[PDB]
């Protein structure tokens, strides 16, 4: 973020890895996979 | 014990989506779990419309819900939510699973969250 | 597919996929399994 | 969260003849990273060398598809999955034979909450 309330007590931030960033076309495929119509197994499996 | 214009749900797990490289790509979830040594995942919505996930003193996500329709898409399925962002052209995904005494307790608290979320942005079911 | 959950403290960037040559039919393995099982080949598992 | 350090880890290989059986071996070393097996409280199992994942599956409900057998300070793993099985083994790191044998025995303990571990 940029403006964090003080009562949250935020000291460090975990930044985004290069590997967590997807090209949009590529993400939009995984999204439809997980939106669950076909199967919800992978969104509640951990 | 914080002021009454902040709502917090504790969470059981949180997961950042990421691509992994095959050496000789394939997908997986980078996973954070609520823990005594590790501190407590909490989701926090202030009434400004600011959203935070955090564990101990570590910020994990932080952005503003207001006017997040073009770039932010949220989806529920039982006691989990899924978040999809699409800022600039880059995109990412994270998910959270809420916590409670029973699968119904957690579900109760999840749904509570989406109602507070539903104040500011649409969330699918 | 491959493992869909990895704790954050492992710090994993790459995954060494499974070679099609490492997947054998379930019985040729079980022959090869029984070899390392028996007492005759105790210490044959510490070969390297 | 308990992890143990490993000297070597090996995948079972069936070489085509142009079959013969060999092990693809991995060794922990400064230019290569340290072989580390870890077992999450959830019930997940991993083997990693530095930043690469070597093994990764879930121990829960694995009596049916996963068998493992101990010998001294080595675990042999055999996994059947969608009617295709395979093996990999591991040798636990340790200062001596007496040090390393412990950590192997510690691990087969930690494994027991989910699968039985053949032990001569």
Curated annotation (Swiss-Prot), chain C:
Name the record gives this protein: Ankyrin repeat domain-containing protein 31
Superkingdom field: Eukaryota
Quaternary structure annotation from Swiss-Prot or TrEMBL: Interacts with REC114; the interaction is direct. Interacts with IHO1.
Impact after mutating residue 33 to A: Abolished interaction with REC114
Disruption phenotype: Fertility defects. Although female mice are fertile, they display fertility defects faster than wild type in advanced age. Male mice are infertile. Defects are caused by delayed recombination initiation. DNA double-strand breaks (DSBs) distribution during meiosis is altered because of reduced selectivity for sites that normally attract DSBs. Spermatocytes have altered DSB locations and fail to target DSBs to the pseudoautosomal regions of sex chromosomes.
Annotated tissue distribution: Present in meiotic cells (at protein level).
Subcellular locations according to the entry: Nucleus; Chromosome
Job description of the protein: Required for DNA double-strand breaks (DSBs) formation during meiotic recombination. Regulates the spatial and temporal patterns of pre-DSB recombinosome assembly and recombination activity by acting as a scaffold that anchors REC114 and other factors to specific genomic locations, thereby regulating DSB formation. Plays a key role in recombination in the pseudoautosomal regions of sex chromosomes.
Species assigned in the record: Mus musculus
From Swiss-Prot, chain D:
One GO cellular component, as annotated: chromosome
Outcome of swapping residue 53 to A: Strongly reduced interaction with ANKRD31
Record localization: Chromosome
Record annotation: effect of changing residue 12 to A: Strongly reduced interaction with ANKRD31
Entry keyword Oxidoreductase: no
Keywords for the protein's UniProt record, in alphabetical order: Chromosome, Differentiation, DNA recombination, Meiosis, Oogenesis, Spermatogenesis
Tissue specificity annotation: Expressed in adult testis and embryonic ovary. Also expressed at low levels in liver.
Domain of life: Eukaryota
Subunit-level organization: Part of the MCD recombinosome complex, at least composed of IHO1, REC114 and MEI4. Forms a complex with MEI4; the interaction is required for MEI4 stability. Interacts (via C-terminal domain) with MEI4 (via N-terminal domain). Interacts with IHO1. Interacts with ANKRD31; the interaction is direct.
Role description: Required for DNA double-strand breaks (DSBs) formation in unsynapsed regions during meiotic recombination. Probably acts by forming a complex with IHO1 and MEI4, which activates DSBs formation in unsynapsed regions, an essential step to ensure completion of synapsis. Required for spermatogenesis and oogenesis.
Similarity comment: family membership: Belongs to the REC114 family.
Name listed for the protein in its UniProt record: Meiotic recombination protein REC114
Record organism: Mus musculus
Range covered out of full length: 17 to 148 of 259
